Design a protein around this ligand. Sequence first.
Ligand code: XYU
Length: 107
Amino acid sequence: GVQVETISPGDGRTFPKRGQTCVVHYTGMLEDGKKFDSSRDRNKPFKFMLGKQEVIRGWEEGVAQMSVGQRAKLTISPDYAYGATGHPGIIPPHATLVFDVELLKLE
Ligand SMILES: CO[C@H]1C[C@@H]2CC[C@@H](C)[C@@](O)(O2)C(=O)C(=O)N2CCCC[C@H]2C(=O)O[C@H]([C@H](C)C[C@@H]2CC[C@@H](O)[C@H](OC)C2)C[C@@H](O)[C@H](C)/C=C(\C)[C@@H](O)[C@@H](OC)C(=O)[C@H](C)C[C@H](C)/C=C/C=C/C=C/1C
């Protein structure tokens, strides 16, 4: 599945409803700690709509339980991320992923 561990707390009240676009700052890395993607390094947040299957299952279930302002470590199982196929040339097969994600605001 997905494990959410809070790094920095949010308001504990404003959770993302379906329909809203979540605007977040993320850093994706493999189980060893090597980064593969980071919106922070680009200085440009990532916007996406929740509950439309836009993102991997770990995000769909993990980001849904975060509050606005919260920063969390999302440890995601390979069947909740890319799985056996992976994402060729970035994420290999059967890869546990770790996302440091911050829910900045909703639009
Ligand atoms: C320029 O950067 C890449 C992202 C890279 C690509 C490589 C990745 C390793 C990683 O580096 O992001 C990564 O960090 C990651 O793992 N992310 C990203 C952050 C959200 C969580 C997760 C992550 O789930 O991303 C997702 C899966 C890759 C594919 C999807 C997993 C669920 C599955 O149902 C989808 O089947 C169609 C495939 C990519 C998403 O971001 C983008 C926004 C969504 C899609 C490509 C599809 O939905 C697509 O459908 C037809 C759409 O509707 C979009 C809105 C259409 C539009 C024309 C194309 C947008 C493409 C944007 C590409 C971006 C932003």
